[PDB]
UniProtKB/Swiss-Prot annotation, chain B:
The name this protein goes by in its record: Galectin-7
CDD domains to which the protein is assigned, alphabetical: GLECT
One record GO biological process: apoptotic process
Keyword Acyltransferase: no
Name of one Pfam family that matches: Gal-bind_lectin
Amino acid sequence: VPHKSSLPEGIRPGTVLRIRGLVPPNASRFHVNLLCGEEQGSDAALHFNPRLDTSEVVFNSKEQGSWGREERGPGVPFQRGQPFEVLIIASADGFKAVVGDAQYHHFRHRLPLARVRLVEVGGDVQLDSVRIF
Amino acid sequence: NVPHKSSLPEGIRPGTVLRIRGLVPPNASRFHVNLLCGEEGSDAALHFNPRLDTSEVVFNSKEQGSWGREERGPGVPFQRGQPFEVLIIASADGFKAVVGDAQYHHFRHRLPLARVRLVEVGGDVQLDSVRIF
Ligand SMILES: OC[C@H]1O[C@@H](O[C@H]2[C@H](O)[C@@H](O)[C@@H](O)O[C@@H]2CO)[C@H](O)[C@@H](O)[C@H]1O
Ligand SMILES: OC[C@H]1O[C@@H](O[C@H]2[C@H](O)[C@@H](O)[C@@H](O)O[C@@H]2CO)[C@H](O)[C@@H](O)[C@H]1O
């Protein structure tokens, strides 16, 4: 079951998204999206896309249906059949992705942080908990 | 119990996250997390003090040797013999203290974030991990 929840107040520097779950044994990909709205194809301030199928974790943003320049994290700190914990931490400069015990990648803001109003977690992932602090 | 004491010579900013994982000993009385202005009784931007003996969690600041106005959180989200996870999250306006799965208390800043240059975790606590993200 995907997570999709509204952040009508937005998120500010000091917001922490904590995701706990398990990558299923047959997983291809899953995604964490910080979106500007609920509509179809909404702009994305952050698309965080662990890809088991292609052994990469892609970061990107989306504006007017156009993806930006992809960033990739170092290695893939996810494994099929294994549980994980991700922090997505918002600062004034960007989003810090923490996986397990280590900062994994820093994605500088493209879209103003104030554009974020929705969080979505979906794809091939079993979710134990999603929290916004 | 081995305490933690580490330097933040660059300071901390909105989006800094202190994650503490540990266990409250079965005979614990109290433990503390301090964000301090320096290496010495240095000023404390945050003193986070779970007290199992008196069933309270106290928050305070200290300047020039004098404690400020105490704040207390609702209940005690710690138990002797039980493991715990605390997030101390810095925003522009204060520190969000998260325990377990929920925000426990918000402590508005008394000292500027730029003056924080040391993290201490000590007292009656067994530390499994202390991370600054
Ligand atoms: O950039 C995020 C999107 O990537 C799309 O796939 C890219 C792929 O990463 C890139 O290597 C290149 O081959 O073009 C593809 C299509 O843009 C995904 O399809 C999309 O879901 C986002 O993950
Ligand atoms: O930062 C709070 C400090 O409190 C001290 O204890 C207080 C106590 O909380 C209060 O209710 C009253 O009884 O006065 C005491 C003395 O200030 C602690 O002793 C100190 O270690 C700090 O935690």
